[PDB]
């Protein structure tokens, strides 16, 4: 187009097609996302001012010929592909730990700036050859808002709560952490109810004891089956107790009891964190 050269279609994003493109003027390659409101323009534009090592930079918001494009710094590979590529032997624990640590740093930053992601998934976690991992698309959900993956959706969202909190991002990261460790999605639901019951079958059907206010949620039904909680040691076996304790805190039903990114960074699991180099096949 006028100021870009579409190198390739890197895929279908939440709001539209995403292409690997090259800016004709600078020659820089970026991830150009076509969006499929004047308030959205204002909000999104504010996001350009979010700089952190673990957040994919939003270089530009382009509103021309009545189309909306978001220009992002280009990263080497997404975690989804990396996990698939590492499925035979699994991502080494030190690297899993480094990634979780960095992602929490990115979340702690966004959240301290009152920005939520709401749709964290391996597809929007990007890595580079130097061992960094970054979160892409923070704050787009709020600015915009509505086959979609439900695997990383927090239970409060599934139960129809209309007010999101920073806790939904911790839940999603918890699901991703488990998946890196076991090499299998933690809650692979095929529908909203299947997603919810898969969570219930593992963590136990929530009640007013563990989640005060749950029985009054919009889509909660007294007729939900009552499953008992499974022992955590069976959920992510290869993980040591520090990792399991941290994961359990990231998967608390009550958003208010769920650990914050900031507090998670101080968890004992990270006492020996390092920054390994991943073996990336580009
Ligand atoms: C469907 O497309 C998506 C979905 C969610 C996030 C992004 C995104 O921001 C990206 S992808 C990317 N490089 C990349 C290089 C090789 C393989 C896959 C992605 N770099 C950025 N910045 C793209």
- Report how far residue 126's alpha carbon sits from residue 108's, in angstroms, rounded to the nearest whole number: 17
Give residue 22's domain range.
1-76
Resolution for the entry shown, Å = 1.9
Domains in the chain, number:
2
CA 193 from chain centre, in angstroms, equals 21
Q: How far is the CA of 10 from the centre of ligand 1 (A)?
A: 6
Q: Which tokens is 248 given?
A: 């359990």
Q: Are 220 and 132 in contact (CB under 8 A)?
A: no
78 is in an annotated binding site: yes
257 is in an annotated binding site: no
Can 119 be counted among the known catalytic residues?
A: yes
Minimum CA distance residue for ligand 1 atom 12: 75
62 & 128 share domain:
no
106 is in an annotated binding site: no
242 & 135 share domain:
yes
**CATH number for the domain including 153?**
1.10.510.10
92 & 217 share domain:
yes
Cα dist. 178→15, 151, 185, 234, 239 in Å?
27, 12, 8, 12, 9
132 & 186 share domain:
yes
Method: X-ray
Position in ligand 1 atom list of the atom nearest CA 18: 2
23 & 86 share domain:
no
- Report how far residue 258's alpha carbon sits from residue 109's, in angstroms, rounded to the nearest whole number: 17
Query: Which residues have CB under 6 Å of ligand 1?
Result: 10-13, 18, 31, 56, 72, 74-78, 81, 123-124, 126, 136-137
Where is the domain boundary, 76, 95, 129? 76
259 & 127 share domain:
yes
3 & 122 share domain:
no
Give pairs for 247-252: CB < 8 Å, separation 24+: 247/174, 247/177, 247/178, 250/170, 250/171, 250/173, 250/174, 250/177, 251/171, 251/174, 251/175, 251/203, 252/210
Q: How far is the CA of 67 from the centre of ligand 1 (A)?
A: 20
Task: Count CB atoms within 10 A of the CB of residue 240.
Answer: 10
106 & 151 share domain:
yes
Where is the domain boundary, 76, 95, 127? 76
């Amino acid at each position: 187009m006028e100021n870009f050269q579409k190198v390739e279609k890197i895929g279908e994003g939440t709001y539209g097609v995403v292409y690997k493109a090259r800016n004709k003027l600078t020659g820089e390659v970026v991830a150009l996302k076509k969006i499929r409101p004047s308030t959205a323009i204002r909000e999104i534009s504010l996001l350009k001012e979010l700089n952190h090592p673990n957040i994919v930079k939003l270089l530009d918001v382009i509103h021309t010929e009545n189309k909306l494009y978001l220009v992002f710094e280009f990263l080497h590979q997404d975690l989804k592909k990396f996990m698939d590529a590492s499925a035979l032997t699994g991502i080494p624990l030190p690297l899993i730990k480094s990634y979780l640590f960095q992602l929490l740093q990115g979340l702690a930053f966004c959240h301290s700036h009152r920005v939520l992601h709401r749709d964290l998934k391996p597809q929007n976690l990007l890595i580079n050859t130097e061992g960094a991992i970054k979160l892409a698309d923070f704050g787009l959900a709020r600015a915009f808002g509505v086959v979609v993956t439900l695997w990383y959706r927090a239970p409060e969202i599934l139960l129809g709560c209309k007010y999101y909190s920073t806790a939904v991002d911790i839940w999603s990261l918890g699901c991703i952490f488990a998946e890196m460790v076991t090499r299998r999605a933690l809650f692979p639901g095929d529908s909203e109810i299947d997603q919810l019951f898969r969570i219930f079958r593992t963590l136990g059907t929530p009640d007013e004891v563990v989640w005060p206010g749950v029985t009054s949620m919009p889509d909660y039904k007294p007729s939900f089956p009552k499953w008992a909680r499974q022992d955590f040691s069976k959920v992510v076996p290869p993980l040591d107790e520090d990792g399991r304790s941290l994961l359990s805190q990231m998967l608390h039903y009550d958003p208010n009891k769920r650990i914050s990114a900031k507090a998670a960074l101080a968890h004992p699991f990270f006492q020996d964190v390092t920054k390994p180099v991943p073996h990336l096949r580009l």
